[PDB]
Design a protein around this ligand. Structure first.
Ligand code: GTP
Ligand code: GTP
Ligand code: GDP
Ligand code: GDP
Lengths: 791, 777
């Protein structure tokens, strides 16, 4: 009949601008999954029952009654459709590690934005296992294990949700936590790239464009070293060649952030470290330090300590249970023999209760000797400083406050070959200084870490840097010029891709921001834009401007969008960063991109880590539930859309018969062709055409969150024929795709079936979203897909 | 704000609207019974992987009461999730019977499929299984009823010819569902009260055509009461001689359900095959049927399907034999009788009618038989005089055929002359009307089963059953008079089922901006639909009436129900509430099996809010302890007399004896006891903002459950799967009166917390005052 208002499926009454807002809102909950591995199936079943009956959590048990790749396929195909349902989902995995390994299950979990718990080692009465199981029921529908990462150090404290003393509330800073998660994942991705490209460990250095403090920690957590690139040097305003002897004067609650601050910076300066007063050095256990050599001096050191430290960090650890001999000015003393003709830095955390000032006289005289050696490239020495008397020092680059010592009096000195050749430190300056430092707030003390970070900063124009050697760079806002910036950034990226460099690029997505503004989600108050020029502002009222970019602009410059989900899942085997709890609308406005050469080299075979599985079904299923679209009816609508499209190209209806089912979109009756800038699309008599359904649903999802569509399109281009699985990868990572008897990934679609889907994409979006879609989002996707399939 | 749980940023009037919208989807469940577990596993995998449907299989690896408890406690939390749920039941009928599984399905607003008799390669079984995958998230079996006759046609969703679309009139279909359920509830009432079959008659207040069909589907006879009788404008003593102008066999159903309303004994002339009768429940009726094509098998199949006593005669009826001893009419001596004459002939039809007319003019006047009504087809080209003609009517489903229906009756015109020209011109006009206007002429037939009278004045002796529909909420009835009428019905132990707009639910829907004044406006309790009086739960409980939801009525009535189901829930229908008399609630409903329970409402709104607002499971109970702390402070209870625990098992512990003043108390708390407040009361207060509420029926049951209570011996114990049972096999006690009234006392602050102060104080107020009456001292 006439009005669609009294017909189903119904888009006209169910999808208005407020439905679109609601889909945006629901996307903040799009990470419901917990993957929990344990070796006791009766225990799994008990907690599965407890959490589903008490909170409605959906529960699955992969117990080995079914072959593992089939059980994964069944379980995660179901889950993929449900990720926007706003209900928790838990998969218990109780098969052996030899059936599905820790690393494979963690990859799958993170590919579905889930938290991951591995406890299969544990006995049935293990207090930790029972604790984590009971936590499922206490916290559901939330969980206190982070998603997509083992650790979290933000303000959220799940135990506060259970305390009457806090009114059973805790902090929740989604954007800040997600931004930190993102910095972590980008670092992890570069770590994975180094590993995949077999870069020598001493060349695992990444350039961060723009000073970004968290990267020091994230890089050392991943065993790579950071260096910042700044266009200009703000004046430290102190004495010494560099102004770091007394210069003028995100959330991360790490337990011993004090010792982490110095040590992660010092581990940047050199792969070889002399550490005096090392015991216990428990904060080092969290880092990845393959390729580092740590010579540790302390009377408390045991054989047990050394072995634990090398096991946990991977560094070469020579632990000697002695006091250091600061009286012997010989390179042959203190075992410094191994550091001959090598770069070395020294972390001195020794101190004495009585005669401290004169203890500092013996060490400083040792460090002044050691700092100008010639058989050892001595790079930097860190020493505690508390001088009540006046003393002159040689080769002193930086006399610095402690950013995490919180109103204490002790200071830190840094010896360097190019520090001041002579300088007398008086005690009234330092007392009046540390008085100023004691006065400043907690936040202000921490931020003096900038002064330590100057020493691992480079001035220069990032757009002019040398990109040879597969150089790794992380770049977003600061990657820009003062002049002609957008054009210069895209040329730089295009050049970087041509050079086979690894410049990782992020930017606000123009058409997603414009869409979120148009439907009324983002206000002019918070973010404005004219064309691709965007003005941001926080409640503080500080404004900054930056350019939005689109997928087709980047592809034209040789760059392919990848999601944060894909980066962390791809990097799962080396990842040692933080996870997250909530998704953030603000973060979802940004897209991240990697150069085309690396996608072609390493990502054309779509295992689950590089797949769109966690986006390709959940928006479609949400809309079908809201709009009353039966499963088979959905495929009928696809057929009707293709019928209308072919008629608009004056294809005569006798050359094809519409089927509109899940297996056949239409059947070709007689030979015809459709003009297309990537074609013509050719259709042969007596064949079935089945268009690419993933293209259609990814085009919807690209309205709301960062899109895997370009990476998918390159994979789809590769999958015109069967492709043998890579021998170096666990076959289980391909569970979600069809595999032939020969062990090959089975072909997906012809180029016709893909480009036909691209051609009807706009009308599909208009149908599913009741003409409240974005033609611009569709158009940039369509243009990029046509470049992928360029003729 | 940057804290969780978070109601301040998550719940605004727009969230409230979205909750109303999600309530249209609150019937996601399918219960599918079959005998083949590998088939069940295959389609479970197919529908969950393709559409995300949540699937459960009850296969007997776990004892049945525990499996049901586990499965449906889980499902109760998910009913507002806007995702399909399928429970496959593969245990034998001996483990859980068809009627029990159907009662459970419908108590959870589900569709129900019973196919456990089928073999693994049954084409019907596979067909219904594949339908799950094709239609998901929808399904083409109706919820809460076997049949459906509305305009929604699921096959059309699959056809390119229709553009893969079909009709969807949620409000009209749910109103028709409602009529059907109200009828089946009265049929359940008649059965529980063992009313004799001859007395199973219900009065419908206000003319409402569909009730004739729903009543005969349940073996009940309808009677309409209307305050004023508009004369139809035609000839004869009642104006029914030429008055001024879905189901595959609605033609035959329309006349026959009406004719079956007039007498328990029927002479059916020309009855074969009468397939449409097989769908009615006709226990208590006797049908004498004449047709040559009648066989013994047709007779047996007819009595088996309907429960009627069928005498099938394989002859032509003899219109030439003018004695009560002929045509076997002897079985009807000293009883009522009506006659349905479906015969016709294509040669000499006029003379055949002439002879039949002579026969019926004699028959209507018999004295050894009380002949109530005779119907005959009428197509005459000659002028002809007629005696005892009560009505001469078009066939409302006659499309454009030229045949009429004559109705003989002892109170018809003693003699009248029917002019063929007049009837011809009447048929000219009728066949040229639109189909809708044609159908609406069935009101002339229903005139003959309508009584004029003020319903508020009617006699209510003998447990009389009345369906007031919405009619008594019309503003021409002062609230004062209706409530005294209802109060008198309850005291007289009558069964008047009463419906009315719920004043406070409607005001809330308007306040939040769901309903516009362009559609509905209200001043206090006077409501104008674009007019009725709204009623509230506290007004009606004072008049002896208890709210019951439509879900509970159909689940309670499930073993006699033979009505229609529905597919969509409807915002408009949910604005209304239904009420039954307290005396029946106390007699038959205080033991809460699953049919009379709030299980399908008490979890799904709370879980939905907790998901939106980031409320952990344990944190929810901490909030409840915090609310109780504040309440006790506000009553100047010294905080050293209690310690807040705020957990699922203890709300607080009592340290020293203390008391709280209360109009139903005082509430007494003994030292060294744990107090656990009634969580169901709090959840139902939320649900009552959005849909009709089981709160008052629940409260009566809760009052009964201060102590353990033995299970009713003549009910399948599996209907009690969802409540705790004691070692000795009793229903375990629920809560003390202190624990219930404490909940009522904090109810307002709980709704303000859960809905970010966008709740309705009036809805909470009417519930709290009714609960206090339930617990009155
Ligand atoms: N991973 C992946 N596999 C595909 C893709 N397209 C086709 N295939 C293979 O072909 C099958 C289905 O193709 P499609 O017609 O796009 O169907 P779909 O993946 O179920 O998506 P819908 O068509 O919307 O139902 C899958 O089982 C794949 O193994 C694709 O885009 N990505
Ligand atoms: N079968 C049944 N049992 C009830 C009902 N109301 C209360 N109970 C019983 O009383 C016990 C405590 O009830 P409540 O505290 O009111 O509610 P609850 O089911 O525990 O749910 P929450 O307290 O909200 O978490 C329950 O575990 C039930 O066994 C009811 O309506 N039906
Ligand atoms: N492990 C665990 N299970 C629970 C907890 N609370 C409830 N459950 C499970 O959830 C089921 C449902 O109980 P529920 O409906 O919440 O009743 P209630 O416990 O009295 O509030 C129970 O049978 C328990 O198995 C809990 O705190 N821990
Ligand atoms: N029985 C049945 N199963 C289906 C149908 N469509 C999909 N499925 C099942 O659902 C599973 C998931 O299907 P889908 O998500 O479309 O992926 P794909 O069919 O493998 O490309 C498949 O293993 C199918 O067997 C259908 O029309 N009937």
């Amino acid at each position: 009949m006439s009005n669609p208002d009294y017909c189903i499926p119904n888009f006209s009454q169910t999808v208005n601008e407020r439905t679109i807002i609601d889909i945006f809102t629901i996307c903040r909950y799009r990470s419901p999954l917990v993957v929990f591995c344990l070796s006791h199936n009766e225990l799994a079943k008990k907690y599965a029952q407890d959490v589903s009956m008490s909170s409605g959590t959906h529960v699955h048990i992969i117990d080995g009654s079914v072959e593992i790749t089939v059980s994964l396929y069944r379980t995660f195909r179901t889950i993929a459709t449900q990720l926007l349902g706003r209900m928790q989902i838990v998969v218990f995995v109780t098969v052996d590690k030899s059936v599905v390994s820790t690393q494979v299950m963690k990859s799958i979990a993170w590919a579905f934005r889930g938290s991951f718990v591995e406890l299969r080692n544990q006995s049935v009465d293990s207090s930790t296992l029972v604790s984590k199981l009971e936590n499922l029921v206490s916290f559901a529908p939330l969980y206190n294990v982070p998603k997509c990462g083992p650790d979290y150090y933000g303000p959220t404290v799940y135990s506060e949700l259970l305390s009457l003393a806090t009114n059973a509330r805790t902090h929740w800073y989604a954007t800040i936590d997600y931004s930190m998660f993102t910095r972590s994942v980008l670092t992890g991705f570069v770590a994975k790239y180094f590993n995949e490209e077999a870069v020598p460990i001493d060349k695992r250095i990444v350039s961060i464009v723009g000073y970004n403090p968290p990267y020091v920690w994230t890089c050392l957590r991943h065993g790579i070293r950071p260096t910042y690139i700044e266009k200009s040097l703000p004046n430290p305003g102190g004495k010494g060649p560099f102004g770091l002897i007394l210069p003028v004067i995100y959330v991360m609650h790490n337990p011993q952030i004090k010792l982490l601050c110095l040590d992660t910076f010092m581990l940047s300066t050199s792969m070889n470290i002399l550490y005096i007063g090392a015991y216990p050095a428990t904060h080092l256990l969290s880092l990845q330090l393959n390729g580092w050599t740590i010579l540790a001096f302390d009377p408390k050191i045991t054989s047990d300590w050394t072995d634990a430290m090398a096991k946990a960090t991977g560094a070469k650890v020579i632990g000697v249970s002695k006091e250091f001999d600061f009286k012997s000015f010989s390179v042959q003393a203190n075992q410094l023999n191994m550091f001959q003709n090598s770069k070395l830095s020294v972390i001195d955390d020794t101190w004495v209760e009585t005669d401290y000032e004169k203890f500092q006289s013996e060490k400083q005289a040792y460090f002044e000797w050691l700092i100008d050696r010639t058989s050892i490239d001595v790079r930097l020495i860190s020493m505690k400083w508390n001088r009540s008397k006046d003393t002159s020092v040689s080769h002193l680059l930086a006399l610095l406050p402690q950013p995490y010592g919180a109103s204490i009096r002790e200071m830190r000195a840094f010896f360097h070959k190019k520090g001041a050749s002579d300088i007398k430190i008086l005690a009234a300056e330092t007392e009046k200084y540390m008085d100023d430092f004691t006065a400043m707030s907690v936040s202000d003390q921490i931020n003096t870490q900038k002064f330590m970070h100057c020493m691992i900063t480079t001035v220069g124009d990032a757009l002019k840097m040398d990109l040879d050697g597969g150089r790794a760079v992380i770049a977003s806002y600061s990657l820009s010029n003062s002049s002609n910036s957008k054009e210069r950034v895209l040329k730089f990226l295009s050049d970087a891709n041509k050079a086979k460099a690894m410049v990782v690029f992020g930017a606000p997505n123009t058409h997603r921001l414009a869409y979120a503004k148009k439907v009324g989600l983002v206000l002019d108050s918070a973010i404005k834009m004219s064309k691709d020029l965007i003005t941001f502002s926080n409640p503080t009222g500080r404004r900054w401007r930056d350019y939005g970019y689109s997928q087709s602009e980047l592809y034209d410059a040789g760059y392919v969008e990848i999601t944060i989900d894909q980066m962390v899942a791809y990097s799962s085997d080396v990842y040692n960063g933080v996870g997250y709890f909530a998704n953030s609308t603000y973060n979802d406005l940004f897209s991240w991109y990697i150069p085309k050469w690396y996608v072609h080299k390493r990502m054309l075979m779509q295992d689950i880590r590089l797949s769109p599985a966690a986006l390709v079904k959940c928006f479609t299923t949400l809309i079908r539930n809201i709009c009353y679209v039966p499963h088979e009816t959905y495929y009928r609508f696809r057929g009707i859309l293709v019928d209308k499209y072919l008629r608009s190209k004056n294809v005569d209806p006798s050359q094809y018969s519409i089927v509109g089912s899940g297996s056949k979109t239409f059947t070709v009756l007689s030979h015809f062709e459709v003009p297309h800038e990537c074609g013509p699309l050719v259709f042969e008599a007596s064949t079935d055409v089945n268009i690419s359904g993933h293209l259609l649903s990814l085009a919807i999802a690209a309205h709301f969150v960062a899109s895997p569509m370009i990476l998918w399109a390159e994979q789809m281009k590769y999958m015109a024929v069967d492709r043998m699985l890579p021998p170096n990868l666990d076959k289980s990572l391909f569970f979600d795709n069809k595999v032939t008897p020969s062990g090959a990934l089975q072909r997906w679609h012809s180029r016709e079936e893909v480009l036909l889907a691209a051609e009807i994409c706009e009308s599909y979006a208009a149908m599913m979203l009741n003409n409240k879609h974005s033609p611009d989002i569709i158009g940039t996707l369509k243009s990029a897909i046509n470049l992928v399939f360029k003729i």
